[PDB]
Amino acid sequence: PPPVRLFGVEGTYATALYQAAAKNSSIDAAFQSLQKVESTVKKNPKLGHLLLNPALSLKDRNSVIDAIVETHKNLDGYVVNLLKVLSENNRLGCFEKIASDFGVLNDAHNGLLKGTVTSAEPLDPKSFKRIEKALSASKLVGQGKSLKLENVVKPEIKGGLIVELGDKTVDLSISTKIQKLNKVLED
Amino acid sequence: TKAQPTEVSSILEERIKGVSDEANLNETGRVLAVGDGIARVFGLNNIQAEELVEFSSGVKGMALNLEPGQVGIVLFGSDRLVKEGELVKRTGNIVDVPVGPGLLGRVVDALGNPIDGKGPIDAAGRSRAQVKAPGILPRRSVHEPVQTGLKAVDALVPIGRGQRELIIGDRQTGKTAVALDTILNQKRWNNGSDESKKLYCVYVAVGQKRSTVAQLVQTLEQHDAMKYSIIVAATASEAAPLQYLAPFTAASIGEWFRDNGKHALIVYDDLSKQAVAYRQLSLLLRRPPGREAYPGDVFYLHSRLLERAAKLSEKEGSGSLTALPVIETQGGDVSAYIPTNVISITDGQIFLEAELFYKGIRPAINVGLSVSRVGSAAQVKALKQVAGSLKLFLAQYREVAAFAQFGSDLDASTKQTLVRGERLTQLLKQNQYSPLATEEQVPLIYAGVNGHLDGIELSRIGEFESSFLSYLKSNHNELLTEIREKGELSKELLASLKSATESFVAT
Amino acid sequence: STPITGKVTAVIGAIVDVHFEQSELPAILNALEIKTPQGKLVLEVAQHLGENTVRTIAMDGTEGLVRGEKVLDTGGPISVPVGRETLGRIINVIGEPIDERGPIKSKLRKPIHADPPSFAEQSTSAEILETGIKVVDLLAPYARGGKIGLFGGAGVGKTVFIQELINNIAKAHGGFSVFTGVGERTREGNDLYREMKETGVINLEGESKVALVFGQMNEPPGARARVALTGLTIAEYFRDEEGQDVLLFIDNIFRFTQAGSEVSALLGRIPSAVGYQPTLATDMGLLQERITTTKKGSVTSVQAVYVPADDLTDPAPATTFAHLDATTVLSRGISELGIYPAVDPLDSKSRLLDAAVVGQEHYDVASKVQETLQTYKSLQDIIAILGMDELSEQDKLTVERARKIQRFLSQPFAVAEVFTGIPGKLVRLKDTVASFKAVLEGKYDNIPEHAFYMVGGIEDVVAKAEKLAA
Amino acid sequence: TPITGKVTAVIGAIVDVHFEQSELPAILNALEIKTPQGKLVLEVAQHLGENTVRTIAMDGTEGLVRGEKVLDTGGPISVPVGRETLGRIINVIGEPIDERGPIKSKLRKPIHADPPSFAEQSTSAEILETGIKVVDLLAPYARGGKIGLFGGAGVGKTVFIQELINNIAKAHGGFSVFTGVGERTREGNDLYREMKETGVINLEGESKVALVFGQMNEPPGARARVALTGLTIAEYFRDEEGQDVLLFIDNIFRFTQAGSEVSALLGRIPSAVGYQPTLATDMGLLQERITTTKKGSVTSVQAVYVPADDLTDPAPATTFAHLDATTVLSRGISELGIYPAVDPLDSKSRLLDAAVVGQEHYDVASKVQETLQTYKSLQDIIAILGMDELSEQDKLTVERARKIQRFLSQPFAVAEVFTGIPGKLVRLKDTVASFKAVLEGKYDNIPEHAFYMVGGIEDVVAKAEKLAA
């Protein structure tokens, strides 16, 4: 079956798009065209960011689609069928949802991996780079699989660190150790 | 957001590819949810409601749910045969059965396959599963008797051609046997002639085991009556949709007789099993269920079924389908939804009580709750005359008998009632497989009602009855001939009968 | 103008969903017609569900509906025909001439959804109908423009009681009547048609002082629901527009409740108590409120109610019990006692009985009756074990009187010259009060108990005493 | 087959597979997931589409890792049948748990099977005697019959059945099947031990009873298909061997119960009480696969653990349809101390016809029924007021009935230990005689306790002398 089975909430639509356009081989193209229309949707503020949510007709929904495909003369044709589907199912709220999901599948085709290095505060770039190197060096990142690593600020955790990527994490935090210390001195 | 029937990834992926249903799916469709003997197919965009769909596995399934998604075809098949992703091809016919006269002497399953293997049925037509009941104007008032040859039934709740009377009472307390007796007494006219006095008999057995059915056919063949009987069967094993479909197609078979202007009688054993079947069906078509889990429109189904039997107008001959519904009462609880519903629909109740069977009253009829609303409109005139105060005696007996056990003082007047009452009850009792002619029920009832049995001791009442009949057969066989021929007791007959009773009550 | 085209989307029993043309939804309670091989199926719009997809209830069978089948829109509430030539016709739910004396000669048509009268219009009368039936006259007098209620169980000759009422009051009264049968059996139907053809209340050339709406239980539950509505509009036409008196009869209103209950599930409404529709109260209310005596007409409904297993506690009977003006309970026991009327005197109670409305004498006489019977019931427990032993002489006279009264109430019905074969007896109200007064005074306590049984007035009781004497 | 899938979900023991192939197992096919626990057998029950079947799991699902390899075994699992299944205890899957090593067989037959047709039937009428007096009087067994025992443990469900095995199956020469669904393990071990002791199994010697045992510890799904497995073994005997068969099923409430458990998980709106909407159909299939065909006569015995003795619960109700004799045994009568504890006004047989057991027998039985019903009727009056405040006629009736009740107590032979009274076996011809006498009150003149816990009429007399001493 096609790489990465997500099957989200209306992510079966994304899956469908992925596999259908994967056999067209125009997934990068599709993704790019989808991104371009998604961006111009995001930069369309009245409607589709203020009537992102529906209340429109079938016919009016269709006419909203016609304006959307009026803006782009490069819009593939599988995502023009996807637009049709979304119009017909009268979902537009799962427009960005599908975009994100198709993106995950797409970047799975690309083989880009994602990670996160939550910390209390944002840290040094030297640390970021050393960790990125380390993670790529480690078997955790496979070869032919790229690494995207995002440091995030998670002041919710005070002190400590957690490295996260490929749903496998190493958590060397202060909080857990403090917890354990406390617990053991409540023994 | 929400689940949608087009979520299915194969449908969905075709839509992305700009591929469409292409209208082949106006008459074909691809299975995609199946299991539990219920399928839902995508396609069939033209499809009559209630149509029969020939599954490409080869099964037939009626279609009862039509959704803009997936039309829900209730399979008549078996799961193991069926496979998912199959194509289904529309029969193009709303459910229909072969109907004729050749069904006489045939056990047939729901789809009309002779399961007794008497080979091809000579069916003079096909009919449709639901056929609307004839109009108010298309009825004629009922007046023609139907008799089971059981004195209690005939006397207390007389049945007429084109009536619905509900046999209700505790499960498998030989419930069936009460009905079978009717078939047996219908031997006398059937063997004879007079078409309007012949009731062809259609016994419908739903939910019953093959062994039960086999016993029934054995008894019917033993009493040689299978010839005028039709047995429509849907055994317990056979599909719940087929069980649901079975009464309505039994009705159609009956309607051919009725329509032809001939009179017939349909026994529906057991409608309770129809309800269970419709329950299964409904809950796997996932409509929200009615109280007691039986579907919310169970009444509509049952009501339409029962109202399709009656006596037609003189315009339409006056062929009468007569019905006897039979409802099993679980723990004798009539407050139960299915019993409540049926009670309203039917034109009589023939309440049976289990305790009275053990008490020795067999047939055990709970005569207080047994009613025939139409009543003695169709009752034989002679039998009407004699049994006029039979109700009063029994009703008085019921009250008096209750008091007597609560240790209240008893006078001669109460003991007159007690003596009379005891004899009447004993008079009513009859052994299974013994229907008795009206000509020989009228004397016995005369004797009882005219109080001569009060004298005769309770133990030997059965002896008296047997001997009395023999005596009348020997001597007052002229009297019997007259009762048969004129069906009314003239003054001469009443006097003759009184004298006859006295002579045999004098031993 | 241009019928909104609808395409069926889902046939899910009676519920049939249609997909009307965009930017135009036929309003809730409208009537859609779909031409079908069997007439025109009428679908009553009952919800809007979104994007011009409605959910409607069928009023005729749903066989052979092809998905996406063109649906014309009539554009408004199911409109029957009304007129004075609707009298003596059998008219089905969607207003078809099932009279079978050919097409009804329409004057006007009216919708079957109409808002009940306002508080201001309603004017409360206080006049007494009398049926000549002893139990009714003494213990629960009926009142002009009333809402009489025949609560009782299964087959207590419910129809038979109504037939007796039709025999007496309807034939007598000059007003119109409307006979409405909701889920009546076709056996009962044929009898009613024949019976009122025979009594000439339906005169086949002559004028008819009754109209018929025979609703058959084989008709879909949805259609069964709006049999009632149809009947109401005919009555409204009489009450208002013809400005005459009416004398509505509906049978059986448990079927009306039941019908709504069935389609409740299909409408997707969460089951309420004992599986009844959650809209039970308001639906009952619309029916009951529609029937009233306005500044204009006056309508006397007699509504049969089937009380499952005589559980009046059952919420559907209990709700109806409140809404009806002049309750009468007919219990099984009384039938079994052989007393026909089956009216249970203790449980039949009408607030029309007053010492002003029927005067002090009538009231006092009835008060004595009520006490006598209630005592008798109380004494039943003592009599059961102890017998007539601990009882006083006074108690013994009361017991004897109660038995005499019990069987004095017994009176044969004219329509039970077939179901009992005894000539019917109707005794005028004043005469009944007098005759009962005598009994209570004990002026006829020398008369045998069975010489009160199943006979009319005092003259008759005395005559049956003479008969027994001989 | 190289048709494989992965485990998408493990929602209870109703695992869901995702067949990644475009070839899909058919419904009622069987799949094996190979585990370090051995194998797990699953059986396809739904296709949910998108190439995801939903499968009943015959064994426990502890430890399953999602995505694990599924491999398709294909079709209903086929158990192994033969004479080499005689005297073997086989697991649900079929593995011999009596450890006589792998059962070699000729024919392996699919667990699911279709029930014999209406054409293929044979109507029995032959009385089969039990030697239990109450049974003989009220509702005698019949060869090929389907007899049923209602009432839960609280009658000692097993104890009644054990007596039947002891009596009937020592005189039965044909094959015999005990299939015990949800049978409490120690009791099953006892049965196996007893059978070997009574030589009906001999593990060096011959056997002529075969065993299928499903313990109540077994996961619900396993319990659901224990019955179907047993029915296959039975079909081989009934059909292929042709030899007459006995069959015992204990407990078929557990069969229903197992179904009721799976139903919710399967995705069904549960019908009344909680039973599966497919309760009737499921009951239908099982009970029409035990019929007496022209190929063979199989006497079947069904044991229903009536939940709290509510017969109104739908599962006991649906059992009544498929039985030709019933012997409902009541907790009340158990409290009265009567073993056998069979309720006498709640027993029935189609074989109680007067042309079957003879008019004299029927008349005798009739009088008992009437007498006992009177006795039950006057229970109210008796409790509220004394028996000396009953009618003269009635006090005799009551006294007779009190004797009849005690008379029905027959010492049990298999519960000879438990009762502590040496068992009895009383001939049917003898039974008719004994009751005839009692009804004529011939020997009624001696203690009611003399009628208590004894065999034949002669025994009552002797024990009266014993009591007199």
Question: Which has the closest alpha carbon to B202: B265, B249, B263, B247?
Answer: B265
The rounded distance, in Å, linking the Cα atoms of D393 and D167 is 40
- DSSP three-state, residue D436: helix
C24: nearest CA partner in chain A: A57
| D193 catalytically annotated | no
The rounded distance, in Å, linking the Cα atoms of D105 and B358 is 52
CB atoms closer than 10 angstroms to residue B381: 13
Distance of CA A148 to the CA centre of its chain: 12
Domain boundary among D76, D105, D132: D76
Instruction: Classify domain B380-507 at the CATH class level.
Output: mainly alpha
Resolution in A: 4.6
- DSSP three-state, residue C102: coil
> Could you tell me which residues come within 8 angstroms of residue B283 by beta carbon, excluding any fewer than 6 positions away?
B289, B293, B295, D268, D269, D271, D277
Read off the tokens for C78: 């199911």
Element (H, E) at B98: strand B96-99
Amino acid at C31: A
Read off the tokens for B203: 């016994």
In chain B, residues with a C-beta closer than 8 Å to the C-beta of D353 are: 432
- D321 in B contact zone (CB under 8 Å): yes
One-character DSSP codes across D336-391: TT-SS-EEEEEEEEGGG-TTTS-HHHHHHHHHHHHHHHHHHHTHHHHHHS-GGGS-
Question: Which has the closest alpha carbon to B99: B129, B76, B119?
Answer: B129
The rounded distance, in Å, linking the Cα atoms of B384 and B378 is 9
> Could you tell me which residues come within 8 angstroms of residue D429 by beta carbon, excluding any fewer than 6 positions away?
none
The rounded distance, in Å, linking the Cα atoms of B364 and B247 is 27
* Distance between D389 CA and the closest CA of chain B, angstroms: 8
Q: Are B32 and B40 in contact (CB under 8 A)?
A: yes
Binding-site entries of D for ATP: 151-158
- Whether residue B296 and residue C262 make contact (CB cut-off 8 A), yes or no, is yes
* Distance between B313 CA and the closest CA of chain D, angstroms: 39
- A89 in B contact zone (CB under 8 Å): yes
Report chain B residues touching chain A, CB-CB < 8 A: 1, 4, 6-7, 9, 12-13, 15-18
Q: Are B385 and B402 in contact (CB under 8 A)?
A: no
CB atoms closer than 10 angstroms to residue A53: 10
Read off the tokens for C73: 């829109």
The rounded distance, in Å, linking the Cα atoms of D391 and C95 is 68
Query: What are the b/e assignments for A147-167, b being 16+ CB within 10 Å?
Result: bebebeebeebeebbbbbbee
Element (H, E) at D96: none
* CATH T-level topology, domain B21-93: Elongation Factor Tu (Ef-tu); domain 3 (2.40.30)
B335: nearest CA partner in chain C: C309
Q: Which residue is listed with tokens 């073993």?
A: D339
Q: Are C462 and C447 in contact (CB under 8 A)?
A: yes
Do you find a cis peptide bond into B288, omega within 30 degrees of 0?
A: no
Domain range for residue D60?
Answer: 1-76
In chain A, residues with a C-beta closer than 8 Å to the C-beta of B16 are: 13, 16-17, 20-21, 78, 81-82, 85
How would you write D33-54 as a 3-class SS string?
EEECCEEEEEEEEEECCCCCEE
First-residue to last-residue Cα distance in chain A: 52
Confirm whether residue C433 is marked as ligand binding: no
Distance of CA D298 to the CA centre of its chain: 13
Question: Which has the closest alpha carbon to B381: B438, B463, B424?
Answer: B438
- B116 in D contact zone (CB under 8 Å): yes
- Whether residue A58 and residue C22 make contact (CB cut-off 8 A), yes or no, is yes
* Distance between A43 CA and the closest CA of chain B, angstroms: 24
Which residues 160-179 of B have a C-beta within 8 angstroms of D?
171-173
In chain A, residues with a C-beta closer than 8 Å to the C-beta of B4 are: 89
The rounded distance, in Å, linking the Cα atoms of B306 and B301 is 9
In chain C, residues with a C-beta closer than 8 Å to the C-beta of B45 are: 67-68
- Whether residue C187 and residue B310 make contact (CB cut-off 8 A), yes or no, is yes
CB atoms closer than 10 angstroms to residue B118: 12
Instruction: Clarify whether residues C336 and C415 are in a common domain.
Output: no
The rounded distance, in Å, linking the Cα atoms of D341 and D367 is 20
The rounded distance, in Å, linking the Cα atoms of B476 and B472 is 4
> Could you tell me which residues come within 8 angstroms of residue D450 by beta carbon, excluding any fewer than 6 positions away?
D460, D463, D464, D467
Do you find a cis peptide bond into C251, omega within 30 degrees of 0?
A: no
| D184 catalytically annotated | yes
Instruction: Clarify whether residues C267 and C240 are in a common domain.
Output: yes
Instruction: Clarify whether residues D72 and D127 are in a common domain.
Output: no
- Whether residue C217 and residue B303 make contact (CB cut-off 8 A), yes or no, is yes
- DSSP three-state, residue B158: coil
To test the contact with chain A by mutation, choose from B2, B8, B11, B17 the residue with the greatest count of A C-beta atoms within 10 A, namely B17
Comparing CB atoms, the residue among D27, D47, D50 nearest residue B80 is D27
Q: Are B300 and C225 in contact (CB under 8 A)?
A: no
Do you find a cis peptide bond into A45, omega within 30 degrees of 0?
A: no
Element (H, E) at D175: strand D175-183
Options D184, D295, D395, D427, the catalytic residue: D184
- Whether residue C65 and residue B287 make contact (CB cut-off 8 A), yes or no, is no
Q: Which residue is listed with tokens 């062929």?
A: B319
Q: Are D28 and D12 in contact (CB under 8 A)?
A: no
Domain with residue D233: its CATH number is 3.40.50.300
The rounded distance, in Å, linking the Cα atoms of C431 and C262 is 48
CB atoms closer than 10 angstroms to residue C466: 11
Question: Which has the closest alpha carbon to B175: B451, B432, B475?
Answer: B432
Calculate Rg over the CA atoms of chain A.
Answer: 21
Which residues 435-464 of B have a C-beta within 8 angstroms of D?
none
Instruction: Clarify whether residues C238 and C303 are in a common domain.
Output: yes
Q: What are phi and psi of D183, to 5 degrees?
A: -85, 130
Domain boundary among D321, D351, D381: D351
Domain with residue C52: its CATH number is 2.40.10.170
Element (H, E) at A99: helix A96-110
Read off the tokens for A94: 């799962």
In chain B, residues with a C-beta closer than 8 Å to the C-beta of C67 are: 44-47, 66, 68, 71
DSSP C312: S
- Whether residue C22 and residue A59 make contact (CB cut-off 8 A), yes or no, is yes
C220: nearest CA partner in chain B: B300
CB atoms closer than 10 angstroms to residue D34: 12
CB atoms closer than 10 angstroms to residue D38: 11
- Whether residue D47 and residue B35 make contact (CB cut-off 8 A), yes or no, is yes
- Whether residue B7 and residue A91 make contact (CB cut-off 8 A), yes or no, is no
* Strand partners of residue B204: B232, B268
Angle D62-D63-D69 (CA atoms, 0-180°, nearest 5)?
Answer: 115
Instruction: Clarify whether residues D344 and D377 are in a common domain.
Output: no
Instruction: Clarify whether residues C470 and C410 are in a common domain.
Output: yes
- What is the DSSP pairing of strand C248-250 with strand C178-184? parallel
Amino acid at D221: G
Angle B474-B479-B485 (CA atoms, 0-180°, nearest 5)?
Answer: 120
Instruction: Clarify whether residues C224 and C162 are in a common domain.
Output: yes
What total number of domains does chain D contain?
3
Read off the tokens for D7: 């485990």
**What is the interface size between B and D, counted as CB pairs within 8 Å?**
153
Comparing CB atoms, the residue among B297, B340, B406 nearest residue C262 is B297
Do you find a cis peptide bond into D459, omega within 30 degrees of 0?
A: no
Q: Is A11-110 assigned to CATH 3.40.980.10?
A: no
Residues in chain A: 187
Instruction: Clarify whether residues D121 and D50 are in a common domain.
Output: no
In chain B, residues with a C-beta closer than 8 Å to the C-beta of C384 are: 403, 406, 408
In chain B, residues with a C-beta closer than 8 Å to the C-beta of D324 are: 211
- Whether residue C186 and residue B295 make contact (CB cut-off 8 A), yes or no, is no
Instruction: Clarify whether residues C337 and C399 are in a common domain.
Output: no
Q: Are B333 and B277 in contact (CB under 8 A)?
A: no
Confirm whether residue C199 is marked as ligand binding: no
The rounded distance, in Å, linking the Cα atoms of C318 and C324 is 10
Angle C63-C67-C69 (CA atoms, 0-180°, nearest 5)?
Answer: 90
CA torsion sign, D319 to D320 to D324 to D327? positive
> Could you tell me which residues come within 8 angstroms of residue D445 by beta carbon, excluding any fewer than 6 positions away?
none
Question: Which has the closest alpha carbon to B178: B191, B189, B169, B188?
Answer: B169
Amino acid at B282: S
Instruction: Clarify whether residues C276 and C162 are in a common domain.
Output: yes
Active site residues of C: 158, 184-185
Confirm whether residue C369 is marked as ligand binding: no
Comparing CB atoms, the residue among A10, A78, A94 nearest residue B16 is A78
- DSSP three-state, residue C327: strand
**Burial tier of C111 (Cβ tally within 10 Å: 0-12, 13-18, 19+):** middle
In chain B, residues under CATH classification 3.40.50.300 are 94-379
Domain boundary among D59, D76, D93: D76
The rounded distance, in Å, linking the Cα atoms of D75 and D32 is 11
- DSSP three-state, residue C46: strand
* Distance between B4 CA and the closest CA of chain A, angstroms: 9
Read off the tokens for B204: 């419908």
Angle C271-C276-C277 (CA atoms, 0-180°, nearest 5)?
Answer: 75
Comparing CB atoms, the residue among B171, B237, B280 nearest residue D278 is B280
Question: Which has the closest alpha carbon to B479: B440, B427, B445?
Answer: B440
To test the contact with chain B by mutation, choose from D271, D285, D439 the residue with the greatest count of B C-beta atoms within 10 A, namely D271
The rounded distance, in Å, linking the Cα atoms of C298 and C293 is 4
Dihedral through CA B309, CA B311, CA B314, CA B317, nearest 10? Answer: 60
Which segments of B75-186 does DSSP mark as H helices, in order? 151-156, 175-185
Active site residues of B: 373
Q: Are C417 and C454 in contact (CB under 8 A)?
A: no
One-character DSSP codes across B62-90: EEEEE-SSEEEEEESS-TTT--TT-EEEE
Instruction: Clarify whether residues C463 and C317 are in a common domain.
Output: no
Q: What are phi and psi of C378, to 5 degrees?
A: -65, -40
Read off the tokens for B109: 């399953």
> Could you tell me which residues come within 8 angstroms of residue C81 by beta carbon, excluding any fewer than 6 positions away?
C91, C95, C104, C106, C107, C108, C109
- C98 in B contact zone (CB under 8 Å): yes
Comparing CB atoms, the residue among D291, D320, D389 nearest residue B211 is D291
Domain with residue D455: its CATH number is 1.10.1140.10
One-character DSSP codes across C105-142: --SEEEES--PPPPTTTB-----EE--S-HHHHHHS-E
Question: Which has the closest alpha carbon to D181: D93, D97, D250?
Answer: D250
In chain B, residues with a C-beta closer than 8 Å to the C-beta of C157 are: 373
Options D32, D43, D163, D183, the catalytic residue: D183
Amino acid at D401: A
Which residues 369-398 of B have a C-beta within 8 angstroms of C?
371, 373-375, 377, 392, 395
Comparing CB atoms, the residue among B295, B307, B408 nearest residue C186 is B307
> Could you tell me which residues come within 8 angstroms of residue B166 by beta carbon, excluding any fewer than 6 positions away?
B324, B325, B326, B327, B342, B343, B346, B348, B349, B350
Question: Which has the closest alpha carbon to C180: C150, C151, C207, C159?
Answer: C159
Question: Which has the closest alpha carbon to B472: B434, B500, B430, B507?
Answer: B500
Instruction: Classify domain B94-379 at the CATH class level.
Output: alpha beta
Question: Which has the closest alpha carbon to D285: D127, D88, D76?
Answer: D76
Element (H, E) at B298: helix B298-306
- A63 in C contact zone (CB under 8 Å): no
